[PDB]
Amino acid sequence: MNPIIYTTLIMTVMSGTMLVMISSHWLLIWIGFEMNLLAMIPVLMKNFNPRATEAATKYFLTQATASMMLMMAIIINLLYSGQWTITKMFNPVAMTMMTMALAMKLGLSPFHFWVPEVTQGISLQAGLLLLTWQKLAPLSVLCQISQSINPNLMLTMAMLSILIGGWGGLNQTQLRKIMAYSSIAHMGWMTAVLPYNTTMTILNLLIYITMTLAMFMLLIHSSATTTLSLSHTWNKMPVITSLMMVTLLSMGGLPPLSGFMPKWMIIQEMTKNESIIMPTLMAMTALLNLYFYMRLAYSSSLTMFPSTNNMKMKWQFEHTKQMKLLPTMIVLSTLVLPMTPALSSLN
Amino acid sequence: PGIVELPTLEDLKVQEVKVSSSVLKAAAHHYGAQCDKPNKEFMLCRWEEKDPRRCLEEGKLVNQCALDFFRQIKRHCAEPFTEYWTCIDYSGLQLFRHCRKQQAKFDECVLDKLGWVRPDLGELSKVTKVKTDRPLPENPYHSRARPEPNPEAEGDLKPAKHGSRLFFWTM
Amino acid sequence: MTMYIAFILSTIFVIGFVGFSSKPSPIYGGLGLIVSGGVGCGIVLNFGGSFLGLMVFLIYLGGMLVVFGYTTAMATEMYPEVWVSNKTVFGAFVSGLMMEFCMVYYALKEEEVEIIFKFNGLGDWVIYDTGDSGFFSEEAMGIAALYSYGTWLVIVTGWSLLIGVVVIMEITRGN
Amino acid sequence: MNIMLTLLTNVTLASLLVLIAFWLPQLNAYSEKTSPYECGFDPMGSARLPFSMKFFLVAITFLLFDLEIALLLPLPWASQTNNLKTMLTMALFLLILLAASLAYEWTQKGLEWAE
Amino acid sequence: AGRIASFLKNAWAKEPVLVASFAIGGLAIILPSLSPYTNYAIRINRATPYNYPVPLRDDGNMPDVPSHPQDPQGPSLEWLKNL
Amino acid sequence: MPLVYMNIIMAFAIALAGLLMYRSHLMSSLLCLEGMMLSLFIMSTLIILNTHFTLANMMPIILLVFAACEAALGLSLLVMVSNTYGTDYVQNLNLLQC
Amino acid sequence: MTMMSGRPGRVPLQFLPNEARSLPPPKLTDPRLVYMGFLGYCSGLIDNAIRRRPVVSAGLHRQLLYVTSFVFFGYYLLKRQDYMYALRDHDMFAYVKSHPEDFPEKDKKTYGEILEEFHPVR
Amino acid sequence: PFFDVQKRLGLDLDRWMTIQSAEQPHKIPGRCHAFEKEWIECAHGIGGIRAEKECKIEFDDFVECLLRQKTMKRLSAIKRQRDKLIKEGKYTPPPHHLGKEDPRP
Amino acid sequence: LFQAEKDRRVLQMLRENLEEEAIIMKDVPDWKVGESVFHTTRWVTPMMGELYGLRTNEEILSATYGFIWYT
Ligand SMILES: CCCCCCCCCCCCCCCCCC(=O)OC[C@H](COP(=O)([O-])OCC(O)COP(=O)([O-])OC[C@@H](COC(=O)CCCCCCCCCCCCCCCCC)OC(=O)CCCCCCCCCCCCCCCCC)OC(=O)CCCCCCCCCCCCCCCCC
Ligand SMILES: CCCCCCCCCCCCCCCCC[C@@H](O)O[C@H](CO[C@H](O)CCCCCCCCCCCCCCC)COP(=O)(O)OCC[N+](C)(C)C
Ligand SMILES: CCCCCCCCCCCCCCCCC[C@@H](O)O[C@H](CO[C@H](O)CCCCCCCCCCCCCCC)COP(=O)(O)OCC[N+](C)(C)C
Ligand SMILES: CCCCCCCCCCCCCCCCC[C@@H](O)O[C@H](CO[C@H](O)CCCCCCCCCCCCCCC)COP(=O)(O)OCC[N+](C)(C)C
Ligand SMILES: CCCCCCCC/C=C\CCCCCCCC(=O)O[C@H](COC(=O)CCCCCCC/C=C/CCCCCCCC)COP(=O)(O)OCCN
């Protein structure tokens, strides 16, 4: 791909997301989603191979189906009320279509099947983009229509997402599939609190995006996509492995790390609404995500795996390209717990 | 939800204008020149009341003025007018430009017998003023009372008591 | 009540949708979609949308010609399937036909909420407006408003079309 | 109403011509006569085999350029608006991007058929 | 000066179609901004009475509104007759 | 509602089910997507015409434009898949698992 | 689920309304600002460590820029957070004042006249 | 989630197309212009929670104008009673309801 | 003149429908003749079905599809 073309496509993806962000008209939100998908499809295929082609095809099919359901829901809402503004949908059936459409776009269970395969089939940069930037628009739409959602369906999908994310991540040796299942579980956590407080959803989004950016950048720096390939990084870059281990502990939600704060705030906010059972199940299930994070940390940093002879040649070379924001993302992913009261600025 | 009131069939009777569309189109310019006042009063009533039941007398006056106009035309020269509207009526689009000689002859006839001047281009489409004794409707939409708004935001902004007060934090 | 023409046209619309949704060979799928586009054009014409129905007919004719070319290029088999050459396709076609029949029957002979709400029928003529004025078509005026009211829509649409050209060229590159 | 009658009459006339052509003459159909034609000989393969399309890229572009017509056909009605400067600006803007899209595919060898 | 002259000569020798297309497109883009009749086109569009002119309720303080179509007040289309 | 509204809604539902249920050919599913778009166009046009909402007479045109974009995207992906495998069957797209 | 986004008279994208200027600004030695500066210093040290540079001494200008940027952003973040909490308290007190029938003042009894149940530990 | 750039800049990117009572070309009105006008002016500035309760009458009227369900129910009941009365011969339709009316302009 | 004639024709059709409805719906126990379906008391433009509900199919065709089918 020509660098100018790649820049234009990334800017088109971002502009479609911003169009979804700033629109007051349902048609313009649909247009933003369409433009985002159209510019997104080539980015998944930048490095050409059959796996990338398959991932792009599955992504296109899933997102096109979700867009069709989105438009059908918009049309039903228009039919039962001559309204185009995104304030609150006037039909329960149209709202159910809208929820199913946005959940399919986000990859919430049981619409989760595409996320691990698409994530595995693409490069690490495309995986970073897919798992960070692609969540903003549907989450913003869901935030705008929060008062209209049916709590039963949303909470069922969130609980299913958390459970399935944990169980699927338990079985993975490929790092991209691990990150995809982690993303599914985090999406479930985010959508669990949306009917109660959108500020909590925004805070969870920000922290999850920071941790995911740090993790993907650390995986790009140590160019590994499997567990055993990452097991070699200790013999070349021990600092990277130590930072990876600390970031993995943060992603598990352990105090006093940053990943603990969104779960803590979500649990307390849900208890304000006399919801006790479901947050308990949610934390007890996120224990599984912590388990496979700990397995990755065992294989990567806390123990030393055998290495190969050719690593000596790699010892003599530095990294030609450096990531500017990696240091900041690590610090924000780990050491921001004392700054919790700043969340009031998000509302 | 209430009973809709309707005028009786007797009150809806009027001396009807039973001339075809070609005749009306042939006479339209002079008709709008002469019968301007009742037509404008009727339209003002119509767009102010937003109810056909409240402007029946104005419509009857419109019918009366149109009948008087056509009676004058019939009394003074019906033959040039008949020629003109027949020429107009032949056309499937009822185009004015195909009948200029008959239109002229009708124009001199009305100008000499009644002092009628055909309006120039751009005059019949003007927005005009109407003087009426009909009171301006107060609530033509039959609106209900608007709900009271939320009171206001007012007062001096003081720092939050004892900080945010989120768990352990003191600020 | 009055000749139920739009009812027949919409029933044929559903029939064509069942035809291309049972998924026979893409040649017959495209034929069914062409029939559906034509009957939908007729439906929209019956409510006063001449421009929109005719335009969707033209657009889908072009799209289905491209689809026929692509089917001959890359979607052929030694024995292309028809609606009666396969048990699965025939079963899907019959199931769709009888589901539409059941919905129509339960719709016109009694009043039931199928999925969203209920309805009695009475033909389409009831919900009309009997508005009497104008030397123009309101559909034409609303569509022409795109160049004076819808500047933002024109901008985003043109950008999306140019990006679509760039995108198809990027995807079909290979290497 | 009239258009439906006209279409029915035309389709009926064509179908009746087919019926006359198929039932009036004498028919003597045998296997050699009804066999596929390739000028002297039996075909090697099937006519239903995949047939490569060397203009596949222009076919996709035709889909996008055909919708340009849908956006441009209301132009005669758009010329009757009061804000002629805005309509002219947007109409010229739309064609300029259509010209630039053609220029992009031309300069990147997108109009040449596959070899 | 001479570089663009040689480029245009080569284009006229090899691709007269594209030269003509670009010239016509450029003229169509630039000429309307310099024309004095564009305002006349806008006024002609404004002067077409598609809908009924609703009269105003007289309150005695509208000296510039006619009380009859043939009164001298209001817009005039004399400019259109001579155009 | 008119019964034509139910007919168009069931057309959308049938096309959605046809997309969701997959046979061997990828092309068949693209046609189902196009059918869903056609049903959406018809339904939106009927709703806009019935209520005489003048300004959304242009909205179905935008719908058609983005439908063309979707169809072009799907055809490009089908081209690449068939170039990879020589066939547009969906069962060949199984290199990636969950 | 959206508490204060629809508050009347809320300008969309200010991040700092003019009414916030009536509140005391956070002190430049605020412990939260010190923590932001410490976070910037940690970012600088991690940047040195990743690039295989002497962690403590390599980039002094870069570490200074890190600390300065973190402190600069944190000052405005603290201002916005304090202003939002002030708005919350203001709205709460106004609502309590305007609805006395939902927040009644009932006479409180002394413990000599309130009967509590005794639970022996044995 | 929703950054109101339009309201901050006063741009009106898509607000011209949101409602049926907002400046149609050539002043062509919507079929339910008055009902929507009434419902919008009832619910303006009081918030979504209150708009649902203190403005339910206007919204019910607007929805009746949009879909005309109650009108169709009333017409169906009237026609069913009319058919029942004719089938037993108790009622006869008037000449002006059978195609023998005296038309008026 | 066209507006005045339209108003009178619509009102006359509504009055005829009202009288026929009063005759027909006398036996129904709790039926109010001419009862509106709207809470508002303002004038509502009559729906097509309301004007031609009790008339012949030819008139309904001419009213609904007469202009669209005219070519
Ligand atoms: C709560 C209250 C406050 C608590 C504070 C929070 C915790 C501490 C702060 C955290 C951030 C600060 C440091 C981060 C950047 C450092 C990165 C690094 O690698 O360090 C190397 C560097 C040594 O390398 P070098 O000197 O360049 O030459 C030796 C070669 O490079 C040879 O080096 P090499 O790279 O070849 O060695 C290979 C080594 C390389 O592996 C490492 O070096 C590990 C580095 C991990 C980075 C930490 C993660 C990011 C921060 C999150 C912290 C989470 C804390 C929460 C609790 C959870 C605990 C994990 O790999 C291994 O050996 C495998 C180890 C795997 C075992 C698993 C443990 C690893 C993670 C443990 C992290 C614990 C927290 C950080 C502790 C301090 C670490 C320096 O360390 C330093 O010299 C800097 C340390 C701090 C010095 C600055 C102090 C200022 C000077 C005094 C001024 C007084 C101020 C007050 C004024 C008073 C008035 C007088
Ligand atoms: C803040 C940064 C700005 C630059 C980057 C922004 C990125 C987005 C692209 C452009 C922003 C869109 C702003 C334009 C919105 C259109 C509405 C506004 O401009 O007013 C119009 C004024 O018209 C202007 O001519 C707008 C056209 C200018 C834009 C065309 C070219 C610029 C687009 C460049 C980016 C697009 C993709 C790349 C193409 C090269 C219409 O006003 P008017 O008609 O009086 O009255 C309407 C009311 N009526 C209907 C009752 C009469
Ligand atoms: C130009 C546009 C206008 C055209 C108008 C004319 C349209 C003509 C349409 C085509 C029909 C004419 C074709 C030629 C005459 C028909 C002959 C044939 O089609 O009918 C025979 C029908 O035969 C039937 O199979 C059995 C005959 C008995 C059928 C009984 C039906 C009921 C009859 C009851 C008997 C009592 C009288 C009942 C009628 C009043 C079958 O013929 P077959 O031999 O295959 O075909 C060979 C054709 N040849 C011989 C002429 C070359
Ligand atoms: C891991 C920690 C999280 C890091 C987050 C990223 C930090 C870098 C971001 C760069 C800062 C600039 C962003 C904003 C500056 C100007 C934009 C401003 O105008 O936005 C206003 C809003 O201000 C911003 O939203 C505040 C952003 C501050 C984020 C920090 C909160 C983090 C939570 C606590 C952790 C402490 C972090 C420590 C800092 C490193 C608009 O208000 P409004 O349009 O009405 O709200 C939109 C959302 N609504 C309508 C749904 C309510
Ligand atoms: C400002 C006006 C813009 C809007 C108006 C234009 C509307 C439509 C015109 C644009 C359509 C797109 C055209 C894209 C051009 C592609 C150029 C190209 O690459 O073609 C080259 C050939 O063309 C070239 O030579 C490259 C560019 C040459 C210059 C073309 C015209 C540039 C401008 C000339 C006139 C400038 C303005 C007119 C002023 C006249 C002087 C008074 C390759 O030829 P092949 O077909 O592949 O060869 C096969 C057999 N050998």
Side-chain angles (χ1 to χ4, degrees), chain I residues 11-29:
Chain I
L11 285 178
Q12 165 154 325
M13 284 210 267
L14 289 167
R15 181 66 178 171
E16 294 167 347
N17 289 355
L18 178 69
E19 291 163 358
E20 287 326 295
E21 189 276 331
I23 301 299
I24 294 177
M25 314 300 297
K26 182 174 72 68
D27 285 339
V28 178

PDB file of all heavy atoms in Angstrom, chain I residues 11-29:
ATOM      1  N   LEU I  11     -67.071  19.459   3.503  1.00  0.00           N
ATOM      2  CA  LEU I  11     -68.016  19.560   4.610  1.00  0.00           C
ATOM      3  C   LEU I  11     -69.321  18.840   4.295  1.00  0.00           C
ATOM      4  O   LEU I  11     -69.897  18.185   5.170  1.00  0.00           O
ATOM      5  CB  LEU I  11     -68.270  21.026   4.952  1.00  0.00           C
ATOM      6  CG  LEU I  11     -67.119  21.703   5.696  1.00  0.00           C
ATOM      7  CD1 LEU I  11     -67.424  23.167   5.945  1.00  0.00           C
ATOM      8  CD2 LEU I  11     -66.834  20.978   7.000  1.00  0.00           C
ATOM      9  N   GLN I  12     -69.804  18.946   3.052  1.00  0.00           N
ATOM     10  CA  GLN I  12     -71.032  18.254   2.677  1.00  0.00           C
ATOM     11  C   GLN I  12     -70.858  16.741   2.734  1.00  0.00           C
ATOM     12  O   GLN I  12     -71.748  16.028   3.213  1.00  0.00           O
ATOM     13  CB  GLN I  12     -71.476  18.693   1.282  1.00  0.00           C
ATOM     14  CG  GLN I  12     -72.527  17.794   0.654  1.00  0.00           C
ATOM     15  CD  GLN I  12     -73.380  18.520  -0.364  1.00  0.00           C
ATOM     16  OE1 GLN I  12     -73.679  19.704  -0.209  1.00  0.00           O
ATOM     17  NE2 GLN I  12     -73.775  17.813  -1.416  1.00  0.00           N
ATOM     18  N   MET I  13     -69.722  16.232   2.250  1.00  0.00           N
ATOM     19  CA  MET I  13     -69.476  14.796   2.329  1.00  0.00           C
ATOM     20  C   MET I  13     -69.408  14.331   3.778  1.00  0.00           C
ATOM     21  O   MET I  13     -69.953  13.276   4.128  1.00  0.00           O
ATOM     22  CB  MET I  13     -68.189  14.438   1.589  1.00  0.00           C
ATOM     23  CG  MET I  13     -68.325  14.438   0.077  1.00  0.00           C
ATOM     24  SD  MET I  13     -67.220  13.260  -0.723  1.00  0.00           S
ATOM     25  CE  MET I  13     -65.813  14.308  -1.073  1.00  0.00           C
ATOM     26  N   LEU I  14     -68.746  15.110   4.638  1.00  0.00           N
ATOM     27  CA  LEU I  14     -68.673  14.750   6.050  1.00  0.00           C
ATOM     28  C   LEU I  14     -70.053  14.759   6.697  1.00  0.00           C
ATOM     29  O   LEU I  14     -70.366  13.881   7.507  1.00  0.00           O
ATOM     30  CB  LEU I  14     -67.726  15.696   6.787  1.00  0.00           C
ATOM     31  CG  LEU I  14     -66.240  15.523   6.472  1.00  0.00           C
ATOM     32  CD1 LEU I  14     -65.442  16.696   7.011  1.00  0.00           C
ATOM     33  CD2 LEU I  14     -65.722  14.210   7.035  1.00  0.00           C
ATOM     34  N   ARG I  15     -70.891  15.739   6.353  1.00  0.00           N
ATOM     35  CA  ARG I  15     -72.236  15.801   6.918  1.00  0.00           C
ATOM     36  C   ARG I  15     -73.089  14.623   6.459  1.00  0.00           C
ATOM     37  O   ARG I  15     -73.851  14.053   7.253  1.00  0.00           O
ATOM     38  CB  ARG I  15     -72.898  17.125   6.540  1.00  0.00           C
ATOM     39  CG  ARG I  15     -74.296  17.315   7.104  1.00  0.00           C
ATOM     40  CD  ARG I  15     -74.261  17.432   8.618  1.00  0.00           C
ATOM     41  NE  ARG I  15     -75.585  17.664   9.180  1.00  0.00           N
ATOM     42  CZ  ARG I  15     -75.864  17.642  10.476  1.00  0.00           C
ATOM     43  NH1 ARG I  15     -74.932  17.394  11.380  1.00  0.00           N
ATOM     44  NH2 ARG I  15     -77.111  17.877  10.874  1.00  0.00           N
ATOM     45  N   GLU I  16     -72.985  14.251   5.180  1.00  0.00           N
ATOM     46  CA  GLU I  16     -73.722  13.090   4.689  1.00  0.00           C
ATOM     47  C   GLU I  16     -73.266  11.815   5.387  1.00  0.00           C
ATOM     48  O   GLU I  16     -74.094  10.982   5.782  1.00  0.00           O
ATOM     49  CB  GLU I  16     -73.551  12.959   3.176  1.00  0.00           C
ATOM     50  CG  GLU I  16     -74.170  14.089   2.376  1.00  0.00           C
ATOM     51  CD  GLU I  16     -73.708  14.097   0.934  1.00  0.00           C
ATOM     52  OE1 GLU I  16     -72.734  13.382   0.617  1.00  0.00           O
ATOM     53  OE2 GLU I  16     -74.315  14.818   0.117  1.00  0.00           O
ATOM     54  N   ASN I  17     -71.950  11.646   5.544  1.00  0.00           N
ATOM     55  CA  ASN I  17     -71.440  10.488   6.271  1.00  0.00           C
ATOM     56  C   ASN I  17     -71.927  10.490   7.713  1.00  0.00           C
ATOM     57  O   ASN I  17     -72.251   9.434   8.263  1.00  0.00           O
ATOM     58  CB  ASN I  17     -69.912  10.464   6.220  1.00  0.00           C
ATOM     59  CG  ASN I  17     -69.381  10.124   4.843  1.00  0.00           C
ATOM     60  OD1 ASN I  17     -70.142   9.804   3.933  1.00  0.00           O
ATOM     61  ND2 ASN I  17     -68.064  10.192   4.685  1.00  0.00           N
ATOM     62  N   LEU I  18     -71.988  11.667   8.338  1.00  0.00           N
ATOM     63  CA  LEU I  18     -72.469  11.758   9.712  1.00  0.00           C
ATOM     64  C   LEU I  18     -73.932  11.345   9.821  1.00  0.00           C
ATOM     65  O   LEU I  18     -74.310  10.620  10.747  1.00  0.00           O
ATOM     66  CB  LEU I  18     -72.276  13.178  10.241  1.00  0.00           C
ATOM     67  CG  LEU I  18     -72.793  13.418  11.659  1.00  0.00           C
ATOM     68  CD1 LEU I  18     -71.946  12.665  12.664  1.00  0.00           C
ATOM     69  CD2 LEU I  18     -72.818  14.901  11.979  1.00  0.00           C
ATOM     70  N   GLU I  19     -74.774  11.807   8.895  1.00  0.00           N
ATOM     71  CA  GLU I  19     -76.185  11.431   8.945  1.00  0.00           C
ATOM     72  C   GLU I  19     -76.371   9.934   8.710  1.00  0.00           C
ATOM     73  O   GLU I  19     -77.151   9.275   9.417  1.00  0.00           O
ATOM     74  CB  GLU I  19     -76.984  12.244   7.928  1.00  0.00           C
ATOM     75  CG  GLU I  19     -77.103  13.718   8.282  1.00  0.00           C
ATOM     76  CD  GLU I  19     -77.524  14.571   7.104  1.00  0.00           C
ATOM     77  OE1 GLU I  19     -77.695  14.014   5.999  1.00  0.00           O
ATOM     78  OE2 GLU I  19     -77.683  15.797   7.279  1.00  0.00           O
ATOM     79  N   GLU I  20     -75.650   9.374   7.735  1.00  0.00           N
ATOM     80  CA  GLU I  20     -75.759   7.940   7.490  1.00  0.00           C
ATOM     81  C   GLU I  20     -75.238   7.131   8.672  1.00  0.00           C
ATOM     82  O   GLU I  20     -75.810   6.091   9.008  1.00  0.00           O
ATOM     83  CB  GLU I  20     -75.021   7.564   6.205  1.00  0.00           C
ATOM     84  CG  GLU I  20     -75.744   8.003   4.935  1.00  0.00           C
ATOM     85  CD  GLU I  20     -77.256   7.942   5.070  1.00  0.00           C
ATOM     86  OE1 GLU I  20     -77.796   6.830   5.238  1.00  0.00           O
ATOM     87  OE2 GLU I  20     -77.906   9.008   5.006  1.00  0.00           O
ATOM     88  N   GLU I  21     -74.166   7.594   9.315  1.00  0.00           N
ATOM     89  CA  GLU I  21     -73.646   6.956  10.517  1.00  0.00           C
ATOM     90  C   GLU I  21     -74.630   7.034  11.677  1.00  0.00           C
ATOM     91  O   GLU I  21     -74.749   6.077  12.449  1.00  0.00           O
ATOM     92  CB  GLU I  21     -72.308   7.606  10.882  1.00  0.00           C
ATOM     93  CG  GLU I  21     -71.506   6.927  11.975  1.00  0.00           C
ATOM     94  CD  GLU I  21     -71.954   7.344  13.364  1.00  0.00           C
ATOM     95  OE1 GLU I  21     -72.454   8.477  13.522  1.00  0.00           O
ATOM     96  OE2 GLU I  21     -71.796   6.546  14.307  1.00  0.00           O
ATOM     97  N   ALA I  22     -75.331   8.159  11.820  1.00  0.00           N
ATOM     98  CA  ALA I  22     -76.364   8.262  12.843  1.00  0.00           C
ATOM     99  C   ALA I  22     -77.477   7.254  12.594  1.00  0.00           C
ATOM    100  O   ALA I  22     -77.976   6.624  13.534  1.00  0.00           O
ATOM    101  CB  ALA I  22     -76.925   9.682  12.890  1.00  0.00           C
ATOM    102  N   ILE I  23     -77.883   7.092  11.333  1.00  0.00           N
ATOM    103  CA  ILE I  23     -78.907   6.098  11.016  1.00  0.00           C
ATOM    104  C   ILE I  23     -78.401   4.689  11.310  1.00  0.00           C
ATOM    105  O   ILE I  23     -79.101   3.874  11.923  1.00  0.00           O
ATOM    106  CB  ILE I  23     -79.359   6.235   9.551  1.00  0.00           C
ATOM    107  CG1 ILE I  23     -79.923   7.632   9.287  1.00  0.00           C
ATOM    108  CG2 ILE I  23     -80.386   5.167   9.214  1.00  0.00           C
ATOM    109  CD1 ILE I  23     -81.135   7.970  10.122  1.00  0.00           C
ATOM    110  N   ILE I  24     -77.178   4.379  10.875  1.00  0.00           N
ATOM    111  CA  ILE I  24     -76.678   3.008  10.940  1.00  0.00           C
ATOM    112  C   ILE I  24     -76.376   2.594  12.378  1.00  0.00           C
ATOM    113  O   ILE I  24     -76.735   1.491  12.805  1.00  0.00           O
ATOM    114  CB  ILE I  24     -75.441   2.856  10.035  1.00  0.00           C
ATOM    115  CG1 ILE I  24     -75.832   3.042   8.570  1.00  0.00           C
ATOM    116  CG2 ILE I  24     -74.786   1.502  10.238  1.00  0.00           C
ATOM    117  CD1 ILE I  24     -74.665   2.981   7.620  1.00  0.00           C
ATOM    118  N   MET I  25     -75.723   3.464  13.144  1.00  0.00           N
ATOM    119  CA  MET I  25     -75.191   3.110  14.461  1.00  0.00           C
ATOM    120  C   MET I  25     -76.152   3.454  15.590  1.00  0.00           C
ATOM    121  O   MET I  25     -75.724   3.800  16.695  1.00  0.00           O
ATOM    122  CB  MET I  25     -73.843   3.789  14.683  1.00  0.00           C
ATOM    123  CG  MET I  25     -72.893   3.688  13.504  1.00  0.00           C
ATOM    124  SD  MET I  25     -72.499   1.987  13.065  1.00  0.00           S
ATOM    125  CE  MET I  25     -71.664   1.442  14.551  1.00  0.00           C
ATOM    126  N   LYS I  26     -77.458   3.368  15.346  1.00  0.00           N
ATOM    127  CA  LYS I  26     -78.438   3.619  16.396  1.00  0.00           C
ATOM    128  C   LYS I  26     -78.569   2.456  17.370  1.00  0.00           C
ATOM    129  O   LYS I  26     -78.783   2.681  18.568  1.00  0.00           O
ATOM    130  CB  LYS I  26     -79.803   3.929  15.776  1.00  0.00           C
ATOM    131  CG  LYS I  26     -80.893   4.247  16.785  1.00  0.00           C
ATOM    132  CD  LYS I  26     -82.173   4.682  16.093  1.00  0.00           C
ATOM    133  CE  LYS I  26     -82.849   3.512  15.402  1.00  0.00           C
ATOM    134  NZ  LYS I  26     -83.384   2.521  16.376  1.00  0.00           N
ATOM    135  N   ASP I  27     -78.433   1.218  16.889  1.00  0.00           N
ATOM    136  CA  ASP I  27     -78.629   0.055  17.748  1.00  0.00           C
ATOM    137  C   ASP I  27     -77.435  -0.211  18.657  1.00  0.00           C
ATOM    138  O   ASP I  27     -77.583  -0.902  19.671  1.00  0.00           O
ATOM    139  CB  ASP I  27     -78.924  -1.181  16.898  1.00  0.00           C
ATOM    140  CG  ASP I  27     -80.330  -1.177  16.332  1.00  0.00           C
ATOM    141  OD1 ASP I  27     -81.193  -0.464  16.886  1.00  0.00           O
ATOM    142  OD2 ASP I  27     -80.572  -1.886  15.333  1.00  0.00           O
ATOM    143  N   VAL I  28     -76.258   0.306  18.315  1.00  0.00           N
ATOM    144  CA  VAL I  28     -75.093   0.074  19.176  1.00  0.00           C
ATOM    145  C   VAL I  28     -75.296   0.810  20.494  1.00  0.00           C
ATOM    146  O   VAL I  28     -75.624   2.015  20.487  1.00  0.00           O
ATOM    147  CB  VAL I  28     -73.801   0.529  18.477  1.00  0.00           C
ATOM    148  CG1 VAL I  28     -72.601   0.335  19.388  1.00  0.00           C
ATOM    149  CG2 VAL I  28     -73.610  -0.239  17.178  1.00  0.00           C
ATOM    150  N   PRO I  29     -75.128   0.152  21.648  1.00  0.00           N
ATOM    151  CA  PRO I  29     -75.556   0.759  22.919  1.00  0.00           C
ATOM    152  C   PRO I  29     -74.736   1.963  23.361  1.00  0.00           C
ATOM    153  O   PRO I  29     -75.303   2.957  23.826  1.00  0.00           O
ATOM    154  CB  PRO I  29     -75.415  -0.398  23.918  1.00  0.00           C
ATOM    155  CG  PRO I  29     -74.409  -1.313  23.302  1.00  0.00           C
ATOM    156  CD  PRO I  29     -74.632  -1.223  21.827  1.00  0.00           C
TER     157      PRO I  29
END
